[PDB]
């Protein structure tokens, strides 16, 4: 008798219990310890290397483990793989579809991913012996736009797409091994922990859900935001992660705490974030707001360590190397400014 | 060595730069188009009536040696707040509106709120909208027969008359002209509500004749880049 009503009432009671359990272990906040650590200061970073080769707006990028080559996607049908050290476009992949929204550099530098409104996550071989690059595998299992994707190895990658479901793909068989379902809004981004065993994924329903790559289920759910979580990136520690949504406020959640630690709010900004990643130490949170600027926030002092000039359009993608050497920001002006 | 691999890298970068400079002229020539509607509003008929032509994602045509990239989204999900931001460098957001499906749900209002969301978007505010009032031939028998009246879905139609700058069609009753041009003026009300000058709506009626429709897109897109360049030089 009225299974929907009673089951939704039970779900609301469970959500209230989750909130009470979160506030029970929340007797303080991350700000209560800012008096113990010293800030970094207003560090103004300049563009050491600029990458002006794209024909359309740059929507996605990703860094390699070598911290030298970086891939970037734009709506011109081209995928440009630059060498950030000497400023040379190592590769130019002609994409099947112009509008692409995701980028993922393989942990071995041998593969790369794509995807957009075509709903196809075209993998490409980088160090292939055939000379130019070619399509490695056409991952066609998503009913919506491919928002973001990450690489786990040269065999399996994960893709968070706009079909409210993430999928751990497999480059060998070309089929989804597991499918992470549970998001109510179209997913917008995702990130992998340094351990690579579990990954977090931010969607448009303000839910930064944490899934486990081994079991394929939903480990934790972080509904602490207020709008579409356009960007999300796991802390270098592996137990926390920052999330930049459309509400112009970034939120730092923690896995073991299962709640929000800090809110990087500011009255001067009213436009949401679309690109977020952490530095090598995680103290600096690079957040690409929609105001043509990028804010380096002090992830432990709850204040912005510096605003970046440069980009004239919306900065849509951001990437910090695995050693934190330099942060590459790609905006909608077909430019990639590499700050350091 | 010191320059052995760097010279090859620079040669590859030069080849990639040549390829990108060759493709930049193409990207500037192929004016991408966003074809969308409030659902089954006749976009499939627009794709069919375009150069007589992986499901339905992107269709390309070319008129007067000017190619276009009409991207359809008939395979995406319901929510449009994110994948529509990818059409920020797009030339024209061709809004195929069903001018006769206002009865069914109120698909007309569904198109208005989407057009209002496209107009007042933070990224689609610099892109004009080619308003394609599809199913105009269906509208002819929808308002005259009394089966579907704008009054049941819009009260402003009672206080609305045919404008002085209207172009009637031979064999079309003024009640249809008053109804059809109300759909244009209703979308144009949202189009002129912003008044930013960076983008203007281009209301056009289609689906009545099976003639070439890509000319209606070419002649609109020509005026789109015209007013885009006019606004660039402050001549508009």
């Amino acid at each position: 008798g009225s299974e929907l009503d009673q089951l939704r009432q039970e779900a609301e009671q469970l959500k209230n219990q989750i909130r009470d359990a979160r506030k029970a272990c929340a007797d303080a906040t991350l700000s209560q310890i800012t008096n113990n650590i010293d800030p970094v200061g207003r560090i103004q970073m300049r563009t050491r290397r600029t990458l002006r080769g794209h024909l359309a707006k740059i929507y996605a990028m990703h860094w390699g483990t070598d911290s030298r080559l970086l891939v970037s996607a734009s709506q011109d049908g081209k995928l440009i793989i630059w060498d950030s050290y000497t400023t040379n476009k190592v590769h130019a992949i002609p994409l099947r579809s112009s509008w692409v929204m995701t980028c993922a550099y393989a942990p071995s530098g041998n593969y790369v991913a794509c995807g957009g409104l075509d709903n196809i996550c075209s993998i490409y071989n980088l160090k292939t012996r055939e000379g130019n690059v070619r399509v490695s595998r056409e991952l066609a299992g998503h009913t919506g736009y491919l928002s973001c994707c990450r690489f786990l190895d040269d065999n399996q990658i994960v893709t968070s797409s706009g079909d409210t479901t993430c999928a751990l793909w497999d480059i060998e068989t070309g089929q989804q091994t597991t499918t992470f379902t549970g998001h109510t809004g179209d997913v917008m981004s995702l990130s992998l922990a340094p351990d690579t065993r579990l990954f977090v994924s931010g969607a448009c329903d303000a839910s930064a859900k944490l899934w486990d790559v081994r079991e394929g289920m939903c480990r934790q759910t972080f509904t602490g935001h207020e709008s579409d979580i356009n960007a999300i990136c796991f802390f270098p520690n592996g137990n926390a992660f920052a999330t930049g949504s459309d509400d112009a406020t970034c939120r730092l959640f923690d896995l073991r705490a299962d709640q929000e630690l800090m809110t990087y709010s500011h009255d001067n900004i009213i436009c949401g974030i679309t690109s977020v990643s952490f530095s090598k130490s995680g103290r600096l949170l690079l957040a690409g707001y929609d105001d043509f600027n990028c804010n380096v926030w002090d992830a432990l002092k709850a204040d912005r360590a510096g605003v970046l000039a440069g980009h004239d359009n919306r900065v849509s993608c951001l990437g910090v190397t695995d050693d934190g050497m330099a942060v590459a920001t790609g905006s909608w002006d077909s430019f990639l400014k590499i700050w350091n | 060595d010191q320059r052995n691999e760097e010279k090859a890298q620079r040669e590859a970068n030069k080849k990639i730069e040549k390829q990108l400079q060759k493709d930049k002229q193409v990207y500037r020539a192929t004016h991408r188009l966003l074809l969308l509607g409030a659902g089954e509003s006749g976009k499939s008929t627009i794709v069919k009536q375009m150069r007589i032509l992986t499901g339905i994602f992107e269709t390309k045509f070319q008129v007067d040696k000017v190619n276009f990239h009409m991207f359809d989204v008939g395979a995406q999900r319901d929510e449009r707040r994110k994948w529509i931001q990818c059409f920020n460098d797009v030339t024209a957001i061709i809004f195929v509106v069903a001018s006769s499906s206002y009865n069914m749900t109120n698909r007309l209002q569904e198109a208005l709120n989407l057009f209002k969301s496209i107009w007042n978007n933070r990224w689609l505010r610099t892109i004009s909208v080619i308003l394609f009032l599809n199913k105009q031939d269906l509208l002819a028998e929808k308002v005259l027969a009394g089966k579907s009246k704008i009054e049941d879905y819009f009260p402003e139609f009672a206080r609305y008359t045919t404008p002085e700058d209207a172009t009637p069609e031979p064999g079309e009753d003024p009640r249809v002209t008053r109804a059809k041009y109300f759909i244009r003026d209703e979308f144009l009300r949202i189009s002129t509500a912003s008044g930013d000058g960076r983008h203007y709506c281009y209301p056009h009626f289609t689906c009545s004749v099976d003639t070439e429709n890509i000319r209606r897109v070419f002649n609109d897109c020509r005026d789109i880049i015209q007013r885009m360049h006019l606004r660039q030089y402050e001549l508009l």
Partner: nanobody
Amino acid sequence: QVQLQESGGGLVQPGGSLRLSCAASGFTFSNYKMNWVRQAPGKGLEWVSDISQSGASISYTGSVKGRFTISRDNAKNTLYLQMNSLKPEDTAVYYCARCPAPFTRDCFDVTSTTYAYRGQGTQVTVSS
């Protein structure tokens, strides 16, 4: 946690009055373009009314234009929908569909179900 509880509604006589109170908790109510979107039984979700971030850009759909009245209250973070002169066609489940992005005027909640910021809804039905 973004949650919207739209209390009110029920089985009322057509042509009377009703008040839907959307308690919207979990976000800054004074920054999102709150709006009401109804779904008729058997039909899709149809946008009903909308209000700006402060209460200036007030708009309703043609089916309820002039009859309904939307009003935001940023002091208590509540959206009120005063339905006047009800219609036999107004029987539907009304959701407190919030605008996706704050400080903007574009809302994409007019689409189909499974929307992000959309409450459980209130089955506002009319009598016969």
